[PDB]
Design an enzyme around this catalytic site. Structure first.
Site, PDB file in Angstrom:
ATOM      1  N   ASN A  47       0.681  -1.303  -0.016  1.00 45.99           N
ATOM      2  CA  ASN A  47      -0.014  -0.020   0.180  1.00 45.99           C
ATOM      3  C   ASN A  47       0.833   1.140  -0.003  1.00 45.99           C
ATOM      4  O   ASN A  47       1.895   1.428   0.695  1.00 45.99           O
ATOM      5  CB  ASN A  47      -0.753   0.064   1.335  1.00 45.99           C
ATOM      6  CG  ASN A  47      -2.043   0.972   1.065  1.00 45.99           C
ATOM      7  OD1 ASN A  47      -2.655   1.353   0.079  1.00 45.99           O
ATOM      8  ND2 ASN A  47      -2.358   1.507   2.379  1.00 45.99           N
ATOM      9  N   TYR A  79      -7.459  13.734  -1.148  1.00 46.65           N
ATOM     10  CA  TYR A  79      -7.010  12.763  -0.101  1.00 46.65           C
ATOM     11  C   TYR A  79      -6.579  13.686   1.227  1.00 46.65           C
ATOM     12  O   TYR A  79      -5.943  14.586   0.826  1.00 46.65           O
ATOM     13  CB  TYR A  79      -6.044  11.909  -0.545  1.00 46.65           C
ATOM     14  CG  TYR A  79      -5.394  10.837   0.598  1.00 46.65           C
ATOM     15  CD1 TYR A  79      -6.110   9.889   1.027  1.00 46.65           C
ATOM     16  CD2 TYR A  79      -4.234  11.152   1.219  1.00 46.65           C
ATOM     17  CE1 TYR A  79      -5.714   9.088   2.069  1.00 46.65           C
ATOM     18  CE2 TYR A  79      -3.671  10.453   2.123  1.00 46.65           C
ATOM     19  CZ  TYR A  79      -4.370   9.343   2.691  1.00 46.65           C
ATOM     20  OH  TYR A  79      -4.055   8.486   3.593  1.00 46.65           O
ATOM     21  N   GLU A  88      -9.621   9.839   7.741  1.00 50.08           N
ATOM     22  CA  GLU A  88      -8.867   9.722   6.676  1.00 50.08           C
ATOM     23  C   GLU A  88     -10.130   9.945   5.293  1.00 50.08           C
ATOM     24  O   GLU A  88     -10.944   9.189   5.444  1.00 50.08           O
ATOM     25  CB  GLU A  88      -8.221   8.508   6.280  1.00 50.08           C
ATOM     26  CG  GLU A  88      -7.528   8.310   5.086  1.00 50.08           C
ATOM     27  CD  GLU A  88      -6.625   6.783   4.866  1.00 50.08           C
ATOM     28  OE1 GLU A  88      -7.334   5.997   5.322  1.00 50.08           O
ATOM     29  OE2 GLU A  88      -5.621   6.798   4.322  1.00 50.08           O
ATOM     30  N   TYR A  90     -11.600  10.856   1.121  1.00 56.23           N
ATOM     31  CA  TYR A  90     -11.376  10.683  -0.304  1.00 56.23           C
ATOM     32  C   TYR A  90     -12.309  11.067  -0.927  1.00 56.23           C
ATOM     33  O   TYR A  90     -13.592  11.005  -0.724  1.00 56.23           O
ATOM     34  CB  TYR A  90     -11.399   9.235  -0.551  1.00 56.23           C
ATOM     35  CG  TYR A  90     -10.028   8.147  -0.008  1.00 56.23           C
ATOM     36  CD1 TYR A  90      -9.065   8.064  -0.895  1.00 56.23           C
ATOM     37  CD2 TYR A  90     -10.138   7.786   1.301  1.00 56.23           C
ATOM     38  CE1 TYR A  90      -8.161   6.985  -0.401  1.00 56.23           C
ATOM     39  CE2 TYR A  90      -9.237   6.695   1.569  1.00 56.23           C
ATOM     40  CZ  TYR A  90      -8.099   6.482   0.834  1.00 56.23           C
ATOM     41  OH  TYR A  90      -7.089   5.629   1.091  1.00 56.23           O
ATOM     42  N   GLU A 180      -2.868   6.461  -4.974  1.00 54.85           N
ATOM     43  CA  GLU A 180      -3.059   5.427  -4.306  1.00 54.85           C
ATOM     44  C   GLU A 180      -2.881   4.119  -4.927  1.00 54.85           C
ATOM     45  O   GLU A 180      -3.635   3.912  -5.961  1.00 54.85           O
ATOM     46  CB  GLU A 180      -4.253   5.296  -3.135  1.00 54.85           C
ATOM     47  CG  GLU A 180      -4.143   4.269  -2.174  1.00 54.85           C
ATOM     48  CD  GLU A 180      -4.949   4.504  -0.909  1.00 54.85           C
ATOM     49  OE1 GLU A 180      -5.333   5.585  -0.720  1.00 54.85           O
ATOM     50  OE2 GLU A 180      -4.796   3.428  -0.255  1.00 54.85           O
TER      51      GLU A 180
HETATM   52  C1  LIG Z   1      -2.543  -4.715  11.320  1.00 52.81           C
HETATM   53  O1  LIG Z   1      -2.312  -3.535  10.822  1.00 52.81           O
HETATM   54  C2  LIG Z   1      -2.958  -3.225   9.294  1.00 52.81           C
HETATM   55  C3  LIG Z   1      -3.936  -3.372   9.279  1.00 52.81           C
HETATM   56  C4  LIG Z   1      -4.483  -3.009   7.855  1.00 52.81           C
HETATM   57  C5  LIG Z   1      -6.093  -2.898   7.581  1.00 52.81           C
HETATM   58  C6  LIG Z   1      -7.155  -2.675   8.391  1.00 52.81           C
HETATM   59  C7  LIG Z   1      -8.417  -2.927   8.097  1.00 52.81           C
HETATM   60  O2  LIG Z   1      -9.265  -2.588   8.769  1.00 52.81           O
HETATM   61  O3  LIG Z   1      -8.928  -3.334   6.754  1.00 52.81           O
HETATM   62  C8  LIG Z   1      -8.122  -4.699   6.344  1.00 52.81           C
HETATM   63  C9  LIG Z   1      -8.909  -4.699   4.741  1.00 52.81           C
HETATM   64  O4  LIG Z   1      -8.167  -4.054   4.350  1.00 52.81           O
HETATM   65  C10 LIG Z   1      -9.320  -3.604   3.071  1.00 52.81           C
HETATM   66  O5  LIG Z   1      -9.064  -4.105   2.216  1.00 52.81           O
HETATM   67  C11 LIG Z   1      -8.980  -3.679   0.617  1.00 52.81           C
HETATM   68  C12 LIG Z   1      -8.936  -4.858  -0.261  1.00 52.81           C
HETATM   69  O6  LIG Z   1      -9.784  -5.989   0.006  1.00 52.81           O
HETATM   70  C13 LIG Z   1      -9.128  -4.520  -1.737  1.00 52.81           C
HETATM   71  O7  LIG Z   1      -8.573  -5.886  -2.597  1.00 52.81           O
HETATM   72  C14 LIG Z   1      -9.233  -5.831  -3.562  1.00 52.81           C
HETATM   73  C15 LIG Z   1     -10.511  -6.831  -3.534  1.00 52.81           C
HETATM   74  O8  LIG Z   1     -10.888  -7.358  -4.772  1.00 52.81           O
HETATM   75  C16 LIG Z   1      -9.989  -7.876  -5.601  1.00 52.81           C
HETATM   76  O9  LIG Z   1     -10.585  -8.357  -6.827  1.00 52.81           O
HETATM   77  C17 LIG Z   1      -9.101  -6.834  -6.045  1.00 52.81           C
HETATM   78  O10 LIG Z   1      -8.075  -7.298  -6.908  1.00 52.81           O
HETATM   79  C18 LIG Z   1      -8.323  -6.309  -4.637  1.00 52.81           C
HETATM   80  O11 LIG Z   1      -7.475  -5.150  -5.019  1.00 52.81           O
HETATM   81  O12 LIG Z   1      -8.235  -3.581  -1.984  1.00 52.81           O
HETATM   82  C19 LIG Z   1      -8.271  -2.316  -1.431  1.00 52.81           C
HETATM   83  C20 LIG Z   1      -7.969  -2.433  -0.044  1.00 52.81           C
HETATM   84  O13 LIG Z   1      -8.428  -1.381   0.917  1.00 52.81           O
HETATM   85  C21 LIG Z   1      -7.541  -0.256   0.901  1.00 52.81           C
HETATM   86  O14 LIG Z   1      -6.477  -0.448   2.005  1.00 52.81           O
HETATM   87  C22 LIG Z   1      -5.687   0.607   2.216  1.00 52.81           C
HETATM   88  C23 LIG Z   1      -6.238   1.834   2.410  1.00 52.81           C
HETATM   89  O15 LIG Z   1      -5.414   3.120   2.404  1.00 52.81           O
HETATM   90  C24 LIG Z   1      -7.487   2.231   1.560  1.00 52.81           C
HETATM   91  O16 LIG Z   1      -8.259   3.226   2.146  1.00 52.81           O
HETATM   92  C25 LIG Z   1      -8.353   0.983   1.425  1.00 52.81           C
HETATM   93  O17 LIG Z   1      -9.194   1.280   0.254  1.00 52.81           O
HETATM   94  C26 LIG Z   1     -10.658  -3.706   4.095  1.00 52.81           C
HETATM   95  O18 LIG Z   1     -11.619  -4.117   2.753  1.00 52.81           O
HETATM   96  C27 LIG Z   1     -10.370  -4.716   4.732  1.00 52.81           C
HETATM   97  O19 LIG Z   1     -10.760  -6.267   4.224  1.00 52.81           O
HETATM   98  C28 LIG Z   1      -3.629  -2.659   6.931  1.00 52.81           C
HETATM   99  C29 LIG Z   1      -2.249  -2.559   7.208  1.00 52.81           C
HETATM  100  C30 LIG Z   1      -2.096  -2.860   8.376  1.00 52.81           C
HETATM  101  O20 LIG Z   1      -0.481  -2.917   8.464  1.00 52.81           O
HETATM  102  O1  LIG Z   2       5.995   8.776  10.215  1.00 51.39           O
HETATM  103  C1  LIG Z   2       4.884   9.111  10.218  1.00 51.39           C
HETATM  104  C2  LIG Z   2       4.213   8.542   9.022  1.00 51.39           C
HETATM  105  O2  LIG Z   2       4.425   7.395   9.126  1.00 51.39           O
HETATM  106  C3  LIG Z   2       2.540   8.905   8.896  1.00 51.39           C
HETATM  107  O3  LIG Z   2       2.271   8.789   7.426  1.00 51.39           O
HETATM  108  C4  LIG Z   2       1.001   8.527   7.145  1.00 51.39           C
HETATM  109  C5  LIG Z   2       0.457   6.750   7.502  1.00 51.39           C
HETATM  110  O4  LIG Z   2      -0.671   6.431   6.873  1.00 51.39           O
HETATM  111  C6  LIG Z   2      -0.818   6.729   5.910  1.00 51.39           C
HETATM  112  O5  LIG Z   2      -1.968   6.094   5.321  1.00 51.39           O
HETATM  113  C7  LIG Z   2      -0.872   8.314   5.465  1.00 51.39           C
HETATM  114  O6  LIG Z   2      -1.005   8.420   4.069  1.00 51.39           O
HETATM  115  C8  LIG Z   2       0.591   8.812   5.874  1.00 51.39           C
HETATM  116  O7  LIG Z   2       0.570  10.055   5.957  1.00 51.39           O
HETATM  117  O8  LIG Z   2       2.449  10.327   9.243  1.00 51.39           O
HETATM  118  C9  LIG Z   2       2.820  10.592  10.339  1.00 51.39           C
HETATM  119  C10 LIG Z   2       4.419  10.668  10.203  1.00 51.39           C
HETATM  120  O9  LIG Z   2       5.042  11.377  11.575  1.00 51.39           O
END
Ligand SMILES: COc1cc(/C=C/C(=O)OC[C@@H]2O[C@@H](O[C@@H]3[C@@H](O)[C@H](O[C@@H]4CO[C@@H](O)[C@H](O)[C@H]4O)OC[C@H]3O[C@@H]3OC[C@@H](O)[C@H](O)[C@H]3O)[C@@H](O)[C@H]2O)ccc1O
Ligand SMILES: O[C@@H]1[C@@H](O)[C@H](O[C@@H]2CO[C@@H](O)[C@H](O)[C@H]2O)OC[C@H]1O
Ligand code: NA
Length: 195
Positions: A47, A79, A88, A90, A180
């Protein structure tokens, strides 16, 4: 002139704030360009999210343009974050293979803005990375019903629509026109401006 970054960083470049973040897997070359422009390319990542904008978000109208190349899972979105509450948010104009936020999004209504119609969702991130470290928090999403690459985002319209369905924004932290990626590869080339 160009400054390419490969590890998470924030700062200012050519009068614009930027934020760039990735977790450990894969590679992102996040390249800062003149004015409000940045490019990205990502490969084998888990990610990442980054872009140019403002250190402190507001109800500013934000315009962007460029290209977005995402055969797998990627987003092109306004974002940002708030604190108190930690949120957060979008405004998604385009995406790749997968329309966010998926089933973890609760549909709350629609908003018309900037010639588009956007679906509104709340989703919850559980023990997830954030601007304040690992945390459990809500995301507010507007997702365009069809893809667009370029135009103006009237942020006030989205903020007001979210508020009308009980989604309260906190104190504004950064606000960027972001690319993203999720478990994918791709590229973008995006230029931001306000007003
Ligand atoms: C332990 O620390 C930690 C925790 C997390 C996650 C925490 C959480 O609450 O959510 C977990 C899962 O992530 C999300 O996932 C999305 C994923 O399912 C999706 O996959 C698609 C599914 O369909 C397929 O056909 C596709 O090819 C495939 O790509 O993709 C998007 C994922 O969601 C993104 O995750 C990152 C965020 O920044 C975005 O906002 C978000 O959209 C949820 O649905 C849960 O199932 C993460 C990382 C750590 O370290
Ligand atoms: O060092 C820290 C960063 O790791 C942190 O970065 C955020 C992590 O979550 C992401 O989803 C965000 O896009 C990103 O900004 O921000 C604070 C900084 O001190
Ligand atoms: Na918009």
């Amino acid at each position: 002139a160009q400054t390419c970054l490969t590890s998470s960083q924030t700062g200012t470049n050519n009068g614009f704030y930027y934020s760039f973040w990735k977790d450990s897997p894969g590679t992102v070359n996040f390249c800062l360009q003149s004015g409000g422009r940045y490019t990205s390319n990502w490969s084998g990542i888990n990610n990442w999210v980054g872009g140019k904008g403002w250190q402190t978000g507001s109800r500013r109208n934000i315009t962007y343009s460029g290209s977005f190349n995402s055969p797998g899972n990627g987003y092109l979105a306004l974002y940002g974050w708030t604190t108190n509450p930690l949120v957060e948010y979008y405004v998604v104009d385009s995406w790749g293979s997968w329309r966010p936020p998926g089933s973890d999004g609760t549909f709350l209504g629609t908003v018309n803005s900037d010639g588009g119609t956007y679906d509104i969702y709340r989703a919850q991130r559980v023990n997830a990375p954030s601007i304040i470290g690992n945390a459990t928090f809500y995301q507010y999403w507007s997702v365009r019903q069809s893809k667009r690459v370029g135009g103006t985002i009237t942020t006030g319209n989205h903020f007001d629509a979210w508020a009308s369905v009980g989604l309260n924004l906190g104190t504004h932290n950064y606000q960027i026109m972001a690319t993203e990626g999720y478990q994918s590869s791709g590229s973008s080339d995006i230029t931001v401006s306000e007003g």
